Every structure is written in structure tokens, then in C-alpha cells.
Design a protein around this ligand. Structure first.
Ligand SMILES: OC[C@H]1O[C@@H](c2cc(O)c(Br)cc2O)[C@H](O)[C@@H](O)[C@@H]1O
Ligand SMILES: OC[C@H]1O[C@@H](c2cc(O)c(Br)cc2O)[C@H](O)[C@@H](O)[C@@H]1O
Lengths: 810, 810
């Protein structure tokens, strides 16, 4: 149907049809009479998978023969979403498969909806790893993603009586056609035990053993015939485990619990032993695999020339002492040489400055679980602090500030400090964030080793986040400037020459309208909710957090409602306000915010005076597959975190690429987005980082705003009195108390500017032609935010490898 | 190479080769450079599996269109062993696959050794179910095996310091290519809760739910193109299970523990709640599946005309009250009609008369776990006892004896009584056993309902137990009488006309020698143990139990050793005595017997005076795949249970078919074996059932035998004094004490006759020609013991269906 989806050749369609029938028969053991829609999905999945394997085998063979430097991306999260459409896109198979299935009497889009999301992540950090894998394969890097194969990913969110309910994401129930178990590469991982000192070094003895079994998933590059590997470890008990008899067999579950479930926290540290076990499990198994592959290419001087290890946040920080352990205890290298190898191999990416998100593990935990690693950490710390003392003689407070060991009630290890000490490069994820790191939390470290500190502004893959989710937009762009932009997003700048092109303006606006109609229909079909498709689609989708300020959005919604009720017969630009995202199960305030949103919708959506002018909808179960649907449909992107809190954001980039305008603070990557598009083409409001700092020195008094803003006063009175909860008048007491007395994120301080800025959004939307022209100026300047750009920067500036767009033989 | 293994046609070999390469590439994602022997096994397994699927789909389609009466074989055990060779045999693919793999540079026998046993059974009862499935498919019956998919089968046995050690049988670690998951046929199973009485009957409410997910395995008939199904249920937690968050997800293991592990008890009842859950789990899921299939053919009058349910022992006895529950509570049938349907549908097979093996469930357990079923059992009991009272007025003791409820310290339900009451047919498994049932333990029931009681003498499948494991013998037989005997074993009688044929005598003896050489080499290669291949191979392989009297064998071995030591320079027929089998982990005496056997070997095997004249070997990890190796190699089969204790035995039949002579008591099927072959061709010794009864009335005094048999006295003195355990003199004190004071199985009583009989075995073995002629007379009369004969009898006399040898279209 559309060009960017590839060719549907006679030969290819015929072959896809026969291979589909073969899999339905031999693989699924079904015929057309007893086959379910799910059977048809799997038949297609296996058919597409067949096309990967040849390229997958020859890619890995190519790496063995050429022996390039290998990149190992270690992450506790890989938020992959669905694989079927992505594989078709990257292999240029989409139109051919669409044709083949149509001829078999099936709708491919219907079949695509059957696939479960691989929800092995919480949000931005996990999705970044997924975009990164796509870009590394597209740029022909010898890259491996290493993580954990969680049996249960991020919970499925149900809304019951306006409250979030959690249920287990049993994503593997029907099987996973994409993975390949590799039980032959199973490796042992050690826990507990004790340290013995001998005449020939230290020995870690009397350990408990858990086996790590790898499952490999292909990661195809964009039409370059490269297929890289994501390797995910699964926990297995050894067969002599606890070996009355029956209980011993049943107790195998304890060991295998390591890979059972993803911790559902985003931007929050929970210091649980199971999480620590998960973190060591991935690191220990991965490092053995790395070293094995390095030897099968004795002399570890060349190790950093052939190996780069990227630490995604501090979660895999134990890689540093684990590498030291293997090099010193097992390979018999001297400390200084082992340390040189470690530092040159490891690099660390920081993703947050929020104090509650920073990993600080109690010493007593590491003492029991990993006795040898604690000893190595202490030694690293002593040697590091000796360097600090020599550099800054007499500065005793610096020594306490920089220490890997934090003293207090319970002694803790600061994993961020460990990462900086043992890495040759430390980067933040957006220019403002990387600057904040050098100025505030890592200031002492920057002063000691300035060369270590870098910036790598985040990006998103234009394959999933344009071609896959918005083929209509991808097509109208390709019609003008060709297809090369898909792996060279900077080419979108060529669209600036079409800003006054009447045909293009109309086409851009048409694609958005179509996307909105499709999403409005999805809401009626799957959720029985009614919306006006001619209204402005105002959307905020991201994890529920106080710092992300879903509460500020709520205040604006109530302001709009109150203004309508005051002057009912006055015209207002109709809006559909959509908010979605999951709350961490133990985060009370976040769960209260979800309830507030639904409670507002309950009042607003059923007021006859409002009509179709204002609708408030909570988007249930926000996840990658839902993002792919709602983002192309959005008119307005809400990126309203308190300045200095959102390290980068990536949702922001997705909305920009897909034809929404942005209302936002100067926070994270918003700053660079506004810089690229021009501030005139961005709806910027609120305090800058400097303004927050000034308010903090003075002391933030929320009462001042309440006293001086009558519209804000009314809302707080409405909340307190039970306007949005008539049967439970005091339901939102915690929210009011927080807002009034202990708001870390200064919601009231940005309220006036936000509401004013929103009025300017409504004004522009009244002029469709000028709205669309501003949209074109955003899409045209979104190029910098391709993860291809990001990965090329990591490659050249951290890993010391050159990216390549050259095809491998088909 | 050999005829019975089928044709190796040019076309077939070429196709097998290309499909093997396809699976290695697309299925296993490997090339010939990085492929392991296990990869080659799986490539072959998938290739052979492809040939099943077409026949499997069309068999089940045929059953849907013809709508025959369906047979449901319910068992907690299916001891299947390996599947690869069996599938090749039944599909006539063995020679073709051998040729294809040879041309690819691979040895097929080497690849066959890689497959894990499906060890989902303990011994005879589980293996009988496996032989039965093979025969039902071969006889073209619409039959389904229903059981549990245990994650862990019977433990792997390790011998350490002469002691049994258990380790988990993680048989699914590398995957199972034979099974197909059917998550679309997942069914709920209910536990606990309470019973509410309404105006419209009783209701079972507030239950806990476990899901039952079926996995289907094909069961091919012998070259008739029939492929039946074995359906095994796996336990799954519902997704809202216990839905802080993390613990709730981890607790899903509790529900899924139902299908985790097979209870490793053979002929012993362990009254554990987990076992009861297993028993209900299989019954509840199966019955829903049966009823669903019956409706998809309202009027349950026709239910018994379309459904037969066979209960393999009392383990699935809950089928009776569960069927009643569904019919009364859910389908709204009146009690009397539901009972009529139940009785006509269900039939029960008893497998033991040992009191410790009989299932008697505490009422308090059933009260808590299955409250509605207990109520139904009480009602069944009241109505049944009213019938007894009307038939035998005033016989109050009969009423207490026949009751389903046993009074005492803890009230118990006798599941055997439940089965008789609710079944239209009750059978024992050998003529002597079925007679014992009518005369002793079920005498009261036989008197009430004589028509209910039948015999069905056990059998073994000649496919696995001759063609597969002994192709050399199968071939020399086929050379004379053709191939038809493989599915018509009675044809072996034609071999009687060759008893004086010099060519045949030589060929029979040659096949045995070859088998012995091959096994003697297997012992050196895999276990580094040395044996003389010219010695008499004296073997006892079966589970370790006091009733099976491995101890009597031990006494004979020591007698032989002592006689050699007394007269070293006297000639004796050299023997290799092999004993193997697993002991239940909690069965202390059985574990002591294993230690005794190894301890004897430790002394005997290292005595220079003995030389190669006597060797004692414990066969480690006895299982189906090992039986297939050792049984063809045996000269002498030990079947020496105390008369009246071995219900049938099936190992006995396997040895008879494979050219071993039998030394045995007149117990179980031994009686019928001797009847078929002629008593002159069998080494019969010891007490008959009547003799045991006489001794029991008098009182068994072991001291009498000790006092009057000096050779026996010496052995007991040797055991007590520490002759076989110098470092631990009192090690075997428990064994001596048992033998002397509390031997339920009268080991001493049969000692003299046994030793005398063994002397006659050695005498015959000295005359190879006459030994072989007697062997021919055994093989020639083994026909009755085909499970094809057994299943044809069940079909005609219990199920009311006619077997068929007619082929389905290929
Ligand atoms: O860098 C990727 C994303 O990481 C997010 C992020 C940072 C963390 O430290 C953790 Br733990 C989870 C997470 O999603 C940031 O909040 C975003 O600002 C950023 O865009
Ligand atoms: O009928 C099959 C076999 O069942 C065996 C047998 C009977 C049982 O009740 C249990 Br529980 C387990 C078992 O293996 C008998 O001991 C054999 O004599 C018989 O041949």
C-alpha cells in the first residue's frame, strides 16, 4: 500500500504464504479448521523469524573472523515491547507479509495485536536500552545487550473504582517465539560463603551456587543485514540442590526466584536482598561470558582494546569489583594492573540526581552475600582516598564526602562513587543534566578527574518511533525527501523548505486527523469510552511521580472546568485531556494521584453544562504498545517536570517526531529540543533551575501562592471540602497537606505561568494552518534526537569504535 | 542393515537429510561448525516428529467424524522412557534415518543416547500405562492417556560409598521436542472453600483456583498410521493470585507446586496433602475435558455409550465423586440417574494386596480440601450400606467391614471400597491375584456383586520390548516366520517347530552372546567395571522392596562365595550376579539392602581366590532406558517374591521374550508363564500361596531354619560379626534383627529350595545346546504376554469396543 513498507514481489509473497502454511501444520500442529487467531499470529512470527536466522548466524560468524572490539551493554532493564512489526520493518518485509496474509484471508494488524509486550523495564531507563540496541545494530557495531530474563515483567495495571490494581504480567504463558535457549552456555554464580587467605592469595569458599542459563534474542539492524544479540540470563538450581526428598525438590524455587520478577520501581531505590542478588547474578554470569569470548579470540593488557562494558546506571556497578576479583584472585594479576584494565574497560552512565533513587547498599548485606566483593570495595576506597588526599592535602571533609563508604546509623556503600572511581568515562543523559552533575552531586569528583566527565544527550529510534508507529507521516515525508532519513534523521531539516508548501501543510494535518480518528475508535472498541476527535488531544504519558507533576496538570484541568462553569456560554477550544502511567505499588502518593485523576474525570465527564468541550481520561496500562498508539495521535505533549529533576526524558522526543507541540519547563532534553526547533516554536513556561535554587535559599512557602491566587484557592477548597469525592469528603487530605506544607517540587510556584501558557496553546490551535506550520518546524528539527546520533557519540567518544552503515551480504 | 528396521529408499533418505539440515539451521540456529552432539539429536528428533503430525491431525479428525466410544485411561504415572527410537520403529523409519545420519557423518545410536527418559513413573504400574498406550494405538482404539506433567520425574540414583543418593531428575532442562503445549484448553481446578445449601441444590463456594494447562504428546500405533494422544496437565497460578507485590508474585510457586514432583513411592501409601492435591488436580481437569468433548459431539443417558474411564489403581478414585458432583450440582441430574451413569462409565484396576499400599485418606484432610466430595462420599456410603443390609440382613460386622468410612483413632476413607462401589468392573492383573481378591480382601464385595469381578493378566508391548531393544533376536525370528508376529505375538508358537533346528539353535545363542558382549562393553565405557562375558548373567532388576526379596538373592550369593572359599580348586559355573533398582527415599530397610549388595560386591569382587568365577554388581540408576540394555543381555531372570505378594510382575515377561530362563516362585504372572511354557521349562521353587498360609497359622519361626541349616547359620554369623563391614561391625544389625524376628516375607523359609534350584540352573548352563533349546521353548510361548492381548480383553470385556488392525490412510 505505502512505499516505506517495502516491496510485495510475486516470488516473496508466494514463499511467505507456503512457509506460513508449513508452520501452521508442522510447528503449531493445526489446520485452518481448528486454528485460533493466536495460532495465526505464531505461524506468522515463526515465518518472519526464519528470515532472521541466516543473517544472525553470519553476523556472529563475521564478528568471529574480523575480531572487532566488542561492546557489552549491561542493564537490569530492556523495555522491548512487541517484536513482530519491528522485525518486518528492519527486514523490509512489511508489505510482503501484509499481502501474503491478506491472500490467506487474514488481517495482519489484527494478528499483531495478539503479541505480548516484552515488558522487561519500568520506563525511560529500560526503553533507552531498547532504542540503543536497535541503533547499535543499525550502525553495525559488535554489540551485546546483557540482562535478566524476568518471568514476570512490569505488572499489568487495572483501574478498579478509580484505583490502581496490579496483576502479574505472565508474558511467557503462551511461549516466546523470538528467544532461543542456550543451556549449553550455562554458567555458575556464587553467593554467601566466606573468604580464606592462603599463601597464594584470597579464596572465596563454602558458597551457594545458582546456575545462569542464557536465552538469546535477535536484534536486527535497519536493512543492513546485521543481526546482533540480546542475551538474558535465567536462574536455575543445580541438580544436587539441598540434596526430606520432596521438600528439597520444592525448595529449588528459592534459587530460581532470582529471575522471577522485575522490581516495579522507577527512579526509586529499594534496598532489598533479592534485588542485590539480581544485580550480582547478571554481572557474574555476564563477566564470565565476556572473558570466555575474549580468550577464544592470557594477556589481559589487550582486554580494554577488545572489550567495552557500559553500565546502565549503578544497577550493574558490581561489575567493577567482580572484574577485579576475577583478575586478581583467579587470573593472578597484580592489583595495579588489574585496576588499570578495569578502569579502561568500564564506563558509567548516570540517569538521575534524585537522592531517593541513588543506590546505597548496607554494608551488612554485602558482608553476608558477597564477602569478597566488600573486601575489594574497601581496598578500592583506601587507594582512591589516598589519591584524593595527595591532590587536596588537609581537606578532611572532601575525604568524607568522596568516600565510597558512608558512615552513620548503618554503614552504606555509595554505588555511584564506586562507578566513578572504577570507570574511564562518566556521562549524563542531557546537556543540563551533565552540567548539574559537575556543579552539584559529583562536583568533588569532577575537580579530581575532569577528563572523565562527558555528556551524551539521549535519543529514540526513528524505526519504532516513526516508521512503525506512524507509517502515514513517514510516507508523506518520504514522498518529498526520499527514504534515507530513516537511518539519517538529520535529513528531516530538508522539510523546512516545505513550511509554506500548501500541499504539505494539508498532508501533515491530514495524517494527524487520521491518527486521532483511529485512536478515538480504539478507545470505543477496547474500553467503551467516548471522545470528540475534533478536540485538542492534550496528553501526559509517563510513570506517575511527584517530580513529573501530573498534579500540576490536574490543577489546570480543574481551572478549565471552573472557568466553564462560571461562564458556560463562552467559547473555549475543546480539549481531550489524557493522562496515563503506572505507579510503583508501594508509592502511596502516586496511587493517590491516579485516584484524583479518575475522580476529576468522574465529575467533568458527566457534567451536562460542559458537554463535549472538556473530557478527562485516564489511559489504563500505559506500556510500549500503547505509546505506539497514543503518541501519533497527540496534539500537545506535556513535559512539565520541575526544572532540574528530569535528567533527560525520552517521551518528549517521541511526541516531537510525531507532530505534537510541546508545553514544557526548561528541564532535561526539553532545553535542547527548544534550542533545535527555536524557542518561538515551543511552549516554554515556569521556573528555570536558577529560579528553583533562589526559592530554595529563601524557603518555599506554598501558602503565599494560595493567598495571592484566588483561582488556586478555589481548587484547594474544592479538594478539601469533598467536591471531587462527595461520599468520602476527606479522601484527598494527604494531597492537600503535601501541596500546602511539604511539596518538594513546587507545584504552586509554576501554576500561574502554566495556565497562562496553556491559554496561548488554545489560541494557536484556533488557527489550524499556523498550528501545522509550527508542527512542521518541530518535526524538521527533531533529527538530533535519533538514538543513532547518541550511539555514534558513545562509539567515538567512549568506546573507541567507528560506526558503519555498510551492508553485510544478504 | 536388518529387515525388520524397514526400507532405506533413495527418495526418503534424501528428504530426511534435507529436513535434518533445515531443522539444524532454522530450528536450532546452528551450523555444522558450532553444533554439539545434542544439537544433532534435536535436529533428528524434530525431523522424525514432522512425520507424526500429519497422521496425528488426521487421526483426531477421523475420531471427530466417526464419533466412536472414547477410552480415557487415568493414571498418576506414565513411565514412557525415550521416544525417538520408538517413533522410528512404529513409523518404519529406523533404517532410513540410520542411512541418512550415516551419510551426514553421524552415528544414530550415539544420538539416541542423548535423549532423557520421560521418567514419569516409579516402576511396574507406571510402565504398564506406557505399554497400554502403545497397544491401544496399535489396536486402533480412540484412547487418551491423562496424567500429570511432573517437572521432576523419578530421582536419578547415585551410589556413594555403597549408599543410594538421590538427585532431581530435571528431564525438561534442555526442552521436550515431543510435547505440544495447549494453553488454549486451560481449565480451572478448585480447592478448599465451603458448601452452601440453597433452594436449588448445593453450591461449592469461596474456593481457591489453580489452572490446569494441558501438554499433548503423540502416541503412534505400529505401522497403522494411527496417532493417539497422551494429555498431561501442568499447574498454573491465575494472574490475580494473591493480588506486598513482590511476595505475592513469588507465592505463585505454591499453586504451581502441584505438578512439580512425582512421589517416589512404589507399592506404598504416603498420606500427604500435596499428593491428594495431585490426585484431585488430574481428575478435575480430565473430567471437564471429557464432558466438553462429549457435548461437542445435554442427554447424559448416552454418556456411558460414548465414554469409558479406566482408573489405574485408586490414585484417580476421586473421579467417582467428581463425576457425581458435576452431574448433580452443575448439570442438575437426580442422584439415582447420575449414579447409574457413573457406575456404567467407571472401571477400576487393582494392582496390590499389600496393606501398606492401600490408599486410606484421613477424613479431616478431605473435609478441608474437598468439602463437597466428602459429603458425596458419605451419601454414596449410606446408599451402598443400605444395599448390603438388604442383601445380608442382620450381618452387622459385614456392614462395618464393607463401609467406605473406616472408624478408629482417625476416621479414614478406604478408596478401594469407593472404587468397587462406583465401578461396573473390577479387575486384578494376573489370574492368581484376581483369585486372591475374590477370596480375601474383597471377599465381601464379591459376594454382593460377583458379576463385577474380572481378571486381565498384564502384558508388555513387543515393539519396545523386542523390536526396539533386541533387533538381532527380532531379525532371526522374522527370517523364519515373517514380520506379522510383531502385532500378533501368538505367532511365536511357530518357533516350536525349530526347537531341533541346528541353524536356529546356533542363531539364538549367537544373538545372546552379542547382547552380552555389548552390555559388558557398556559397563566398561560408562562405569569402568570389569565382567566376564562367558559367565552366566544372573539378573534381578526391579524396585527395592522387602517383598521382592533381593535379600534372598543376597543369601544365595554369599552361599556361592562361601562354597568357593571352602573348596577353591573345585569347578563352578562362573556367574555375573547383577542387582539393580531404586529405593524409596524414606524406606530405611530398602536403603540398607542396597548397602548390603555393594558391601558383598566389595568383598567378593576383590578376593583373589574367587577370580573371574563370581562377580557381584549393583546396577546404578535402573530405569526404562537401562532395562532396554540389560534385559536382552540376561541369561537368568530372578522373580523370587514371596508367593501372594507380587500382583503380576511385568519385568518377568520382558526377560521371557528376550531369551532368559526364569527362576521364580509361583507368584503373580509367573504361574501363567510356567503354564504357557510348561513347568519343565521353568525353574520353579519355594512355597506356594497355600504353604505361606499354613506357616502363618502355625506362626513363622525363623530361628528354626537358622538352627537346622548350617550354611544359613554361617551367613548370619558373617553378617552379625562384621565380615562384610570390618570398619563398622554392627552396620547390618537391623537386617539380621528383621530376618531373625520380624520378617513378613519368610526369606529363610524358601532358602533351601532356592539354593537347590540354583544348582539345577548351573547344571543346565553347562550344556549350552540344551539351555538354548529350553530358551526357544520360552520365547515360543511368550505370546500371551503381549499387551495387545491384554488391551483386546479390556476392550471387549470392560469397555465394550472392538479393536481393529486396519490401517488409516497415510
Ligand atoms: O536516561 C533515560 C531516562 O532515565 C530515567 C530513569 C532514571 C533512573 O535513574 C531510573 Br532508576 C529509572 C529511570 O526510568 C530518567 O528519569 C529520565 O529522565 C531519562 O530520560
Ligand atoms: O500391574 C502393574 C504392576 O503394578 C505394581 C504396582 C502396584 C501398585 O499398587 C503400586 Br502403588 C505401584 C506398582 O508399581 C505391582 O507391584 C506389580 O505386581 C504389577 O505388575
Amino acid at each position: 500500500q505505502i512505499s516505506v513498507r517495502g516491496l510485495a514481489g510475486v516470488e516473496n509473497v508466494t514463499e511467505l504464504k507456503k512457509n506460513f502454511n508449513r508452520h501452521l501444520h508442522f510447528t503449531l500442529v493445526k489446520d485452518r479448521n481448528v486454528a485460533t487467531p493466536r495460532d495465526y499470529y505464531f505461524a506468522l512470527a515463526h515465518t518472519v523469524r526464519d528470515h532472521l536466522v541466516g543473517r544472525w548466524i553470519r553476523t556472529q560468524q563475521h564478528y568471529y573472523e574480523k575480531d572487532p572490539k566488542r561492546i557489552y551493554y549491561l542493564s537490569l532493564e530492556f523495555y522491548m515491547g512487541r517484536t513482530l512489526q519491528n522485525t518486518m520493518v528492519n527486514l523490509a518485509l512489511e508489505n510482503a507479509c501484509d499481502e501474503a496474509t491478506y491472500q490467506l484471508g487474514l488481517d495482519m494488524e489484527e494478528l499483531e495485536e495478539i503479541e505480548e509486550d516484552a515488558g522487561l523495564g519500568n520506563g525511560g531507563l529500560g526503553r533507552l536500552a531498547a532504542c540503543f540496541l536497535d541503533s547499535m545494530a543499525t550502525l553495525g557495531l559488535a554489540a551485546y545487550g546483557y540482562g535478566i530474563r524476568y518471568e514476570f515483567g512490569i505488572f499489568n495495571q487495572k483501574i478498579c473504582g478509580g484505583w490502581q490494581m496490579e496483576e502479574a504480567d505472565d508474558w511467557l504463558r503462551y511461549g516466546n517465539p523470538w528467544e532461543k535457549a542456550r543451556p549449553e552456555f550455562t554458567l555458575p554464580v556464587h553467593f554467601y560463603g566466606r573468604v580464606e587467605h592462603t599463601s597464594q592469595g584470597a579464596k572465596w569458599v563454602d558458597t551457594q551456587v545458582v546456575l545462569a542459563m542464557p536465552y538469546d534474542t535477535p536484534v536486527p539492524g535497519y536493512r543492513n543485514n546485521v543481526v546482533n544479540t540480546m542475551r538474558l540470563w535465567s536462574a536455575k538450581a543445580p541438580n544436587d540442590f539441598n540434596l526430606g526428598y520432596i521438600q528439597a525438590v520444592l525448595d529449588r524455587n528459592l534459587a530460581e526466584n532470582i529471575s522471577r520478577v522485575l522490581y516495579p520501581n522507577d527512579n526509586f531505590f529499594e534496598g532489598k536482598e533479592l534485588r542485590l542478588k539480581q544485580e550480582y547474578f547478571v554481572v557474574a554470569a555476564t563477566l564470565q561470558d565476556i572473558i570466555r569470548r575474549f580468550k577464544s579470540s592470557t594477556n589481559f593488557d589487550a582486554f580494554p582494546d577488545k572489550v567495552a562494558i557500559q553500565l546502565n546506571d549503578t544497577h550493574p556497578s558490581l561489575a567493577i569489583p567482580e572484574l577485579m576479583r576475577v583478575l586478581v584472585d583467579l587470573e593472578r594479576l597484580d592489583w595495579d594492573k588489574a585496576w588499570e584494565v578495569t578502569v579502561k574497560t568500564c564506563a558509567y552512565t548516570n540517569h538521575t540526581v534524585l537522592p531517593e533513587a541513588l543506590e546505597r547498599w548496607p554494608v551488612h548485606l554485602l558482608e553476608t552475600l558477597l564477602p569478597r566483593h566488600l573486601q575489594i570495595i574497601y581496598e578500592i576506597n583506601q587507594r582512591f582516598l589516598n589519591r584524593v588526599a595527595a591532590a587536596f592535602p588537609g581537606d578532611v571533609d572532601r575525604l568524607r564526602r568522596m568516600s565510597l563508604v558512608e558512615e552513620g546509623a548503618v554503614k552504606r556503600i555509595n554505588m555511584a562513587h564506586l562507578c566513578i572511581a572504577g570507570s574511564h568515562a562518566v556521562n549524563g543523559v542531557a546537556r543540563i543534566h551533565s552540567e548539574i552533575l559537575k556543579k552539584t552531586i559529583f562536583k568533588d569528583f569532577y575537580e579530581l578527574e575532569p577528563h572523565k566527565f562527558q555528556n551524551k544527550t539521549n535519543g529514540i529510534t526513528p524505526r519504532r518511533w516513526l516508521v512503525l508507529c506512524n507509517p502515514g507521516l513517514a510516507e508523506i515525508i518520504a514522498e518529498r525527501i526520499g527514504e534515507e532519513y530513516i537511518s539519517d534523521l538529520d535529513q528531516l531539516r530538508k522539510l523546512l523548505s516545505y513550511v509554506d508548501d500548501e500541499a504539505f501543510i494539508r498532508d501533515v494535518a491530514k495524517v494527524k486527523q487520521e491518527n486521532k480518528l483511529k485512536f478515538a475508535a480504539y478507545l470505543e472498541r477496547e474500553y467503551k469510552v467516548h471522545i470528540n476527535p475534533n478536540s485538542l488531544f492534550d496528553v501526559q504519558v509517563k510513570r506517575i511521580h511527584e517530580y513529573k507533576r501530573q498534579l500540576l496538570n490536574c490543577l489546570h484541568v480543574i481551572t478549565l472546568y471552573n472557568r466553564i462553569k462560571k461562564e458556560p456560554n463562552k467559547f473555549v477550544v475543546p480539549r481531550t485531556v489524557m493522562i496515563g502511567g503506572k505507579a510503583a505499588p508501594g508509592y502511596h502518593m502516586a496511587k493517590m494521584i491516579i485516584k484524583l485523576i479518575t475522580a476529576i474525570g468522574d465529575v467533568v465527564n458527566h457534567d451536562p453544562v460542559v458537554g463535549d468541550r472538556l473530557r478527562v481520561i485516564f489511559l489504563e496500562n500505559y506500556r510500549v504498545s500503547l505509546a505506539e498508539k497514543v503518541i501519533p495521535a497527540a496534539d500537545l505533549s506535556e513535559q512539565i517536570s520541575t526544572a532540574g529533576t528530569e535528567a533527560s526524558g525520552t517521551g518528549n522526543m517521541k511526541f516531537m517526531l510525531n507532530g505534537a507541540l510541546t508545553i514544557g519547563t526548561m528541564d532535561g532534553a526539553n532545553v535542547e529540543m527548544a534550542e533545535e526547533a527555536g524557542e518561538e516554536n515551543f511552549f516554554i513556561f515556569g521556573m528555570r533551575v536558577e529560579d528553583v535554587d533562589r526559592l530554595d535559599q529563601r524557603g518555599y512557602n506554598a501558602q503565599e501562592y494560595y493567598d495571592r491566587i484566588p483561582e488556586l484557592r478555589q481548587i484547594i477548597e474544592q479538594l478539601s471540602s469533598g467536591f471531587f469525592s462527595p461520599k468520602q469528603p476527606d479522601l484527598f487530605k494527604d494531597i492537600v497537606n503535601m501541596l500546602m506544607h511539604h511539596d518538594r517540587f513546587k507545584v504552586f510556584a509554576d501554576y500561574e505561568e502554566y495556565v497562562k501558557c496553556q491559554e496561548r496553546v488554545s489560541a494557536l490551535y484556533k488557527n489550524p494552518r499556523e498550528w501545522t506550520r509550527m508542527v512542521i518546524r518541530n518535526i524538521a528539527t527533531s533529527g538530533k534526537f535519533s538514538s543513532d546520533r547518541t550511539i555514534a557519540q558513545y562509539a567515538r567518544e567512549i568506546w573507541g569504535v567507528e560506526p558503519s552503515r555498510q551492508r553485510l551480504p544478504a
